[PDB]
């Protein structure tokens, strides 16, 4: 009778929404029982129902976000909420290629006269 997350992931959006509606109705009934001097057995179910509602909402949200990420894959100008967060400073940084850019003379210098491997023995 307990909710299993791995079983929720195998359900469709409509079934998840129906289960969420049923859980919300049960939670409302439990609140009514609580306000009407309900027994401790009914009161203990409030936590279970709230956990089930949270689990269903989490599964729905994760499925939707995965779908959106797949839809926006291999595409530029993603929604801000779907872009990497990191930090502000890191986001502002120059790319690795931009950091490695150099003038033609510097490239010629590194190609012609790199630091050689040498030893001092003989």
């Amino acid at each position: 009778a307990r909710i299993k997350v791995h079983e929720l992931r195998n359900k469709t959006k409509t079934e998840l929404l129906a289960q969420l509606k049923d859980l919300k109705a049960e939670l409302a009934l439990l609140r009514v029982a609580k306000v009407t001097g309900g027994a401790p057995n009914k009161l203990s179910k409030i936590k279970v129902v709230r956990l089930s509602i949270a689990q269903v909402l989490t599964v729905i949200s994760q499925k939707q976000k995965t779908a959106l990420r797949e839809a926006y894959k291999n595409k530029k100008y993603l929604p801000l909420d779907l872009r990497p967060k990191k930090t502000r400073a890191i986001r502002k940084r120059l790319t690795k290629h931009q950091v490695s850019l150099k003038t033609e003379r510097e490239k010629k210098k590194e190609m012609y006269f790199p630091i050689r491997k040498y030893a001092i023995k003989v």
Partner: protein, 155 residues
């Protein structure tokens, strides 16, 4: 003030207590510098740990002109006399100083001889293992190559 004492002139009228530098980190600094040296030696293996070769120069002023010490880098004239192109010298462990002028024959000749000794004592690995170029060394010389820890040419 009283008695016969030297006139005091202690410079302690500012907030000197906020500018006191203590040396409780001296052993830590020594350890950190040793660790940096060891890491550098591992990185530059098998290049000598003493660093690039430096020229022999005179001391400045009449107080030290009899003294000989190490300069920043070899002059362009010295490199030309020794036959070492200036663009190649830094890559083979020879420091280059384009500023130092050569006013006397003795210093120039001394540094040219020093460069010749370094060249005689230098072993250069090829850029590519299977390709041997003009300045590269023979396989026999390369095989018996080791990192030198101390100063290889004391002044």
């Amino acid at each position: 003030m009283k008695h016969n004492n030297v006139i005091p002139n202690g410079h302690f009228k500012k907030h000197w207590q906020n500018y006191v530098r203590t040396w409780f980190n001296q052993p830590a600094r020594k350890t950190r510098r040793r660790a940096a040296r060891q890491q550098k030696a591992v990185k530059i293996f098998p290049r000598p740990t003493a660093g690039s070769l430096r020229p022999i120069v005179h001391g400045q002023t009449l107080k030290y002109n009899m003294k000989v010490r190490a300069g920043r880098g070899f002059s362009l004239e010295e490199l030309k006399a020794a036959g070492i192109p200036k663009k190649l010298a830094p890559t083979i462990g020879i420091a280059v100083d384009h500023r130092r002028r050569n006013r006397s024959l003795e210093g120039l000749q001394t540094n040219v001889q020093r460069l010749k000794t370094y060249k005689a004592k230098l072993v250069i690995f090829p850029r590519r293992a299977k390709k041997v170029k003009a300045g590269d060394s023979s396989a026999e010389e390369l095989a018996t190559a080791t990192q030198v820890q101390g100063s290889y040419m004391p002044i």
